[PDB]
Amino acid sequence: PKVVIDGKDQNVTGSVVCTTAAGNVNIAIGGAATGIAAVLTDGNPPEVKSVGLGNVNGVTLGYTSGTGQGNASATKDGSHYKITGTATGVDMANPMSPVNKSFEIEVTCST
């Protein structure tokens, strides 16, 4: 599993678990210390509906489709998923302007 936020590798150790419901793919990495999750469509190519990166460098980052904030794309190659885009968050100290960091997620939902 590979998670990169703002060009910085998170070196994630948490396991990757994927499930399906109501025509969507739910991807989740790790647990409390990680809090990463994603929601894709079960089509090809998959459309990113949301990505949650948890709290990184003081900001709770995530992407949400149809908000005008950030962007996100995904590709599926077998069980492998690649999600790239720009996540947004609130600057707790200076809420004047939002925070935009790029992210890249590469996971396999196998074994």
User: What's the distance, Cα to Cα, between the start and end of the chain in Å?
Assistant: 13
Q: At what resolution in Å was this solved? A: 2.9
| AA letter at 52 | G
Q: Bridge partners of 95?
A: none
Domain boundaries, the chain: 1-111
C-alpha torsion sign, points 1, 40, 36, 32: negative
CB atoms within 10 A of CB 110: 9
Residue 105, class by beta-carbon neighbours within 10 Å (0-12 exposed, 13-18 middle, 19+ buried)?
A: buried
Peptide bond connecting 45 to the previous residue in cis, omega within 30 degrees of 0: yes
Experimental method: X-ray
